[PDB]
Amino acid sequence: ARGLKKHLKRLNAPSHWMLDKLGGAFAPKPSSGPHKARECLPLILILRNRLKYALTYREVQSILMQRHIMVDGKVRTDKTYPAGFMDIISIPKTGENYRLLYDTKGRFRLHSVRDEDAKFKLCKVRSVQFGQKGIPYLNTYDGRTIRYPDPLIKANDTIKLDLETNKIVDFIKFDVGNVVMVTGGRNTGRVGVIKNREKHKGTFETIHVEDAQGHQFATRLGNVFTIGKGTKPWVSLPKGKGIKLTIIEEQRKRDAAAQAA
């Protein structure tokens, strides 16, 4: 082409949106934003698809034009704003809060929470480096750039981030022994504990992560995101506690729910 592309045809959309292949020719094209448009969920989907506060593309438009919806602390009018991992979606009119985290099946969930968990998010740092006049600052994987961090926060670490004062209020030093949620691949969502990290000079490094109930799996360092120091999380895990399972097991669970029903 001779420039950018502004359309997203439905069959080409990320599979984890669960859009239906006959519901129309196009999909919502994720606007440029803090998340990488293949690991995001736009606002249109959250309202009309999941929450069903709307029935059409135009109805979700109106809702934002009343400004009921706030994302990550700030009011967003954009229809296709790219919400992502560990954002907060809050509707003060209804008085509800959500974190965005993954199913074990690797799909975003709106995890309902109180106000006290809305005050903060978690972010992993992309890099820490000097800048104008040697003033230290850090990149996150959320687009954010925080200047003047602890000299302890190195690359790949994770930070607590108050949305009111906006600076680092805590940080986890990414290393072996903490709990992590995976944000890509076939293992995305699966939480567990770093058991080993083997590096390879000139390539990606592999993380070894084990479910609380024994099952062992591996990803590459890109798709890893520490939640808490040690076994305990610093956020509320979703409806399933990050433990992925065989197809037989959920078959057993239904009939086990179908013997009581």
Binding site: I135, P136, R147, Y148, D150, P151
Partner: protein
């Protein structure tokens, strides 16, 4: 041949018809915006001096200042300069147009002629808003630039 007069001193313009060679011999063979003596044009223009400037012809192709021929040349003209006033033409567009030259000659049809000689609190609020907001960026600067210093 047909002449369209105007004056900036008052703001009135008028079209006349003349067809006499000797009344236009000192009209032929000259150029736009260079003054012409008025007396040749007749006995009822004395003291009046015209600045001859502009004119169109049979085929309607205007004179363009700066092209030295009683000809009809094909120039590449930008939308915004004289003799090209395209509307809705996608800025950056040009054309090769046909324009008569600025030498006043037999082949014009209308000559254009002009007469030279007749015969707050908002700004205050908004100004000091910025100044208070420039002074805070250095207020914020020092507020964190030394907290990290103690560390």
């Amino acid at each position: 041949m047909k002449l369209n007069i105007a004056n900036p001193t008052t703001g009135c313009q008028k079209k006349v018809e003349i067809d006499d060679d000797m009344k236009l011999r000192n009209l032929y063979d000259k150029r736009i915006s260079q003054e012409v003596v008025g007396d040749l044009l007749g006995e009822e223009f004395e003291g009046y001096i015209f600045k001859i400037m502009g004119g169109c012809d049979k085929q309607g192709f205007p004179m363009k200042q700066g092209v030295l021929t009683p000809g009809r040349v094909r120039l590449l003209l930008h939308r915004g300069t004289s003799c090209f006033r395209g509307h809705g033409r996608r800025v950056g567009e040009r054309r090769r147009k046909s324009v008569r030259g600025c030498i006043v000659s037999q082949d014009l049809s209308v000559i254009n002629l002009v007469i030279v000689k007749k015969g707050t609190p908002l700004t205050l609020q908004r100004k000091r808003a910025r100044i208070a907001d420039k002074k805070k960026r250095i207020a914020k600067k020092k507020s964190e630039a030394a907290e990290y210093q103690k560390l």
